[PDB]
Amino acid sequence: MNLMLALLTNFTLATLLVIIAFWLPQLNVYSARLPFSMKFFLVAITFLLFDLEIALLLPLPWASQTANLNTMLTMALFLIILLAVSLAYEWTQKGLEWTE
Amino acid sequence: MSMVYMNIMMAFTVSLVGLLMYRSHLMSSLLCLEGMMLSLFVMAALTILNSHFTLASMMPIILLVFAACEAALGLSLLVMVSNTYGTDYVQNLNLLQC
Amino acid sequence: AERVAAFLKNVWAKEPVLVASFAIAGLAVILPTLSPYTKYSLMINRATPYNYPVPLRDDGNMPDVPSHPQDPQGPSLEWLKRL
Amino acid sequence: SMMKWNRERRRLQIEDFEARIALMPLLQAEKDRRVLQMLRENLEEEAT
Amino acid sequence: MNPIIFIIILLTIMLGTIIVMISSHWLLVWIGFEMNMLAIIPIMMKNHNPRATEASTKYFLTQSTASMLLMMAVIINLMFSGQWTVMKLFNPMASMLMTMALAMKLGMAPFHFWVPEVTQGIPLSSGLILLTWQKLAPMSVLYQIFPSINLNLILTLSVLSILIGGWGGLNQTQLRKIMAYSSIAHMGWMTAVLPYNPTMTLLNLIIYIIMTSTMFTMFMANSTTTTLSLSHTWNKTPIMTVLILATLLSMGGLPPLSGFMPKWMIIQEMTKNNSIILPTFMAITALLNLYFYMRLTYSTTLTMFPSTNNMKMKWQFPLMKKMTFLPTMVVLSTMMLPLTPMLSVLE
Amino acid sequence: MFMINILMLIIPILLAVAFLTLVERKVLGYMQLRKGPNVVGPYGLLQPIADAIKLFIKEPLATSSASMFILAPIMALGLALTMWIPLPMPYPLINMNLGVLFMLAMSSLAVYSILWSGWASNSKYALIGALRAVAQTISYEVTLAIILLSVLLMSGSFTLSTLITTQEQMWLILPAWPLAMMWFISTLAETNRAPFDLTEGESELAGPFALFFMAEYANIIMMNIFTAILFLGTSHNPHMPELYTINFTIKSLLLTMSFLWIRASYPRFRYDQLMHLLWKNFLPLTLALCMWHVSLPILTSGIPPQT
Amino acid sequence: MMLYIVFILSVIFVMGFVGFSSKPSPIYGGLGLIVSGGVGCGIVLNFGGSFLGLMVFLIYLGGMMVVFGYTTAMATEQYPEIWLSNKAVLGAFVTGLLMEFFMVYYVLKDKEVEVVFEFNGLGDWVIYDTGDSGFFSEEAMGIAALYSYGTWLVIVTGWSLLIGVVVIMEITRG
Amino acid sequence: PGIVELPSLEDLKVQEVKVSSSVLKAAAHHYGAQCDKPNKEFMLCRWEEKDPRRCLEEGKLVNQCALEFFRQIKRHCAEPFTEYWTCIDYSGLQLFRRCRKQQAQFDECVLDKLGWVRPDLGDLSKVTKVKTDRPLPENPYHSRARPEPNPEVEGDLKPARHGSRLFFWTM
Ligand SMILES: CCCCCCCCCCCCO[C@@H]1O[C@H](CO)[C@@H](O[C@H]2O[C@H](CO)[C@@H](O)[C@H](O)[C@H]2O)[C@H](O)[C@H]1O
């Protein structure tokens, strides 16, 4: 209940601050493609794919508690190396360049 | 079945009907596709958590990861379509009629 | 070898960030196999009792199984205390 | 320094976990009676 | 495409299929389809044109929808049995959803509309993969879940595909569309016999793949995508016209050629089960396919169509395309009937 | 009782933000051989109040979508306050078992306020500026998440108060100063602070404005509080918790003041150059150090406890 | 009552789905999916899925849906059409909204309902597990097992993500 | 289906150990050493019978041993123990490492006046062995008779009679 109360308070207050911010006494009586750039799209997609790999690494602090450490360490490094290979491929294919 | 399954199953059906009844934007149909995944993630998580199927706890994550990768591919196709015609309208994808 | 050292000096001058990255990544892959302490990581993890240790029905032929927690038989953690 | 402290923290965790193991039979004995009492109580009301 | 990347993408297409075929867990089956679909899109797009982009997008939407329905069937199956083992499903609604999902992936009627359009819009080599290798993974799942499949649903899907495939091919002059509708009809034979004898499904699938690969390879050797273009073959590679004639007659199911064998054995298995009306209806309906196979033979081999003057320039250069395995594939496509009892290896 | 506790967090956060604007102006001023605000109240102590009143009675000067024009500042300010509720100082308002993940999850949502306000700007050029800002923010989210995971492999859990225990004997900046360096820079880039203040840079080449400003400056304080806990752990004495709060406040103030110090000291990055700093420099090192910090506890037998 | 919190969240879940499934402007459709994602996390949280719930926020909302909105602003819609101004969208939205309410009314009135299939209506709390006194999170133990039991899952998943990068670079090079 | 047999409300009654969890945590290490035998007999029963109704008598002995355990602390070491568990009770996580001085006073008191020795690190997590006159259950799962396996196939593999026998083929 406490977290729900905290969230409701934070955003309820934010709503109220926006309210009075827009309405105070004034005292007066009188879908195309946005110049599409492919490079910014690939940044977003690259972030997504790296974000999914981060999702796979987040369990690592718990995984280190296993007795199967031989398997666990090998798979942890394997995942990170494959992430590095992804970066290396994008790098060498000019995917990190902002010219042209 | 438990009461929650009614609405989660309904949500999948709503998104499936949404996906099968296209309008104009291809993006709108992609959102329904990701809505389907979301309802699948929730239903799978509920079943796995409630039954205490411990090792299956990773399955919703795998589903999420692969489905996000599929969505990334779909978004790439959408931008290539948009580059060709200037919109993501599905009525433009009718060359293979003939 | 001399060609190897000349290559390393070149990258050290032009791309020290990448040289450091690869060196750190190489140490991470290699050092666990060379470390005398890596074996204790396996032992400490196994020694942590997450669930209840269910007792065994005594059939009269288990001289290696302690009858009481403070009896001498059974695994000892004295190696862990001194660690 | 981190290795030494984490090793001590592992020893402190084992001691904490062993305190739980000492108490688990008592807690299990209580949980059994509480569950059976509740089921028995639910049974009296069903009969009525 | 970089040649090394093309190899790795081809291997990923194969790996995704292999994962589906070796998996005992439903999640891994789903992963195999996801990986396979991811790797095939780049070879549909490789020639970079609006038609190839439309085909890749139409393909993506169909397969993604089918994979969502498959995951639904898996999750419903988990709810009602508490397990993921790849086998019979434990809930009739799950069985219908998986059957419909796999029918969509195979392009069976009435989920067939994408097959002619996607095949037309991609290169011949990509169409070769689409209409042969891609059938393996869905058919291998059907091989394992067939005990729980609704008999009326599967036989209705089969009958519709044989009719739609047969009729759809009659109106085609594009070779890729002819192959697409031909593929739809042949899928119907494969699923019609599956409830009775899955072994005969495997036999039909293997032989279909062999003849389909032969035809695509022969189209690729001459860079022919239309009937009229194929009609110039006689004035360039006369041997090729004879091979095309023999292969088409085999795909028509004419004895004594290899393509008679799957239809022959499917009719046997169905009659052993007192199914007489259905096999007879299927065999007569397959005459539609024979008609538009015969039409191609008339314009390719049995008559000489008009030529062009610039064709003479082609007489001075040899075929340099790989035509890999073509001599073996054509002989298997036509001359295998005397070895029919060898089908027991598939048991 | 709990609602009082929430307000004893929300109100001081907004007051701290107000007077950070004064501290920033005066610290920058003295580094520039001048004074900064010193007329509006003694030593400028009423300057934030005058600025606040002024902005709120200013004319509130068409949106392309009213719902998103109002959603963006509510999201920004609401999310910013939410990031504070799991912070242990030394006791959190909400004690989350996965507090670190919660902060990571909530911070990833903050980019929607940028996106929504770009959509509501009704201007092609403002939408493009918003998309450039979003690309920067998500780029540096990558290293922040990986750096955080590397540190937690020494702590053992996603609970923020466990970082206190992990640093009972020693600050984590000593075993992890290479990560501390990239973490600190990543926070600057994440908050669009100089030399990464490209939204205000590239742009020039009332109440609603104030609300976005409060959200950003609350995030700046919060990020430096997170940095203090992550790398400069204060010792907690359960019988004298105020001792922790004093020491931990001083560290957070100094870290915040170093954000101002850095603004005063360097020119701005080009957009492509700050992208290369991330994708070609920080990310390679972060990946290599992530592998290293996975291996190190195993090879030293220094794996922390799960609990 | 708070005892029906999961059901109430599930009701909101459906309305958000009817929101984007009727397909207004993709800007608003994206908003409807975000609200459903947050509500979907809340449902998962109340079944003990703390880590799973937060992954929806971190990955589904903070990653995938951010990229969806980024792409929409760049290649689909830059200015949203007024919500429900289209007749089909309004009709589809109203049609789905009424179906959900009729479902919710009856299940609450009778504490059960048959919408094609039979659903109990006593509250999802009734099926919960009655014994839990372990010193760990079972969800965390299961997810952590990916690195000990799921070697094969890691290999195929990691490979697919690498091919995702390779494939997308091929698709977009044109 | 039949009736779930439940013990009467009277058969469940027993004298409770109504002390808080910091008290139990404070006494846990000596409690495990002192009351091991009835405790392990009870836990063996639970894991063998898989039925709480079948171990009520052993569960009652667990309670009696604990009550007698805490009566001996009260008789002799009430004051040092109270300081110790009050120290534990202050911590939000009830941490042992915050109370080593008070633990030392309680540990020295029980050793002096009761001979109790605190078990070492690792002791209480051992798998021990219990001697019980209770008979080992036969069918704790209440399994039915398993279905009979399919008739096995044995013999010599000979060539197929006249080959495939497929239509006209002679091999
Ligand atoms: C592109 C693919 C990249 C894949 C990269 C994979 C790299 C893997 C490198 C290290 C893998 C093994 O790393 C480490 O090796 C030593 C070898 O003594 C193992 O052995 C060590 O730990 C085990 C515990 O399991 C002890 O029993 C043993 O006495 C000890 O020496 C470790 O258990 C293992 O953690």
Ligand SMILES: CCCCCCCCCCCCO[C@@H]1O[C@H](CO)[C@@H](O[C@H]2O[C@H](CO)[C@@H](O)[C@H](O)[C@H]2O)[C@H](O)[C@H]1O
């Ligand atoms: C194409 C639609 C796509 C959207 C799909 C929407 C989700 C569908 C959810 C299906 C889950 C319900 O599945 C259905 O549950 C009921 C509950 O007992 C089962 O049970 C029902 O039929 C069997 C018949 O022997 C008996 O149990 C009983 O008569 C009846 O209760 C059904 O056998 C099962 O098919």
Ligand SMILES: CCCCCCCCCCCCO[C@@H]1O[C@H](CO)[C@@H](O[C@H]2O[C@H](CO)[C@@H](O)[C@H](O)[C@H]2O)[C@H](O)[C@H]1O
């Ligand atoms: C943080 C709490 C602060 C509490 C302070 C409470 C004070 C309430 C009295 C506010 C008086 C504001 O005074 C008034 O503000 C509005 C702001 O647009 C100004 O502007 C207004 O008037 C001008 C014409 O004069 C109009 O063209 C304009 O559209 C209108 O906005 C006025 O020129 C100013 O006279």
Ligand SMILES: N=C(N)NC(=N)NCCc1ccc(I)c(Cl)c1
């Ligand atoms: N960037 C600075 N430090 N100076 C500055 N002019 N800040 C902005 C001024 C400001 C905005 C909102 C509020 I509420 C307050 Cl009190 C003050």
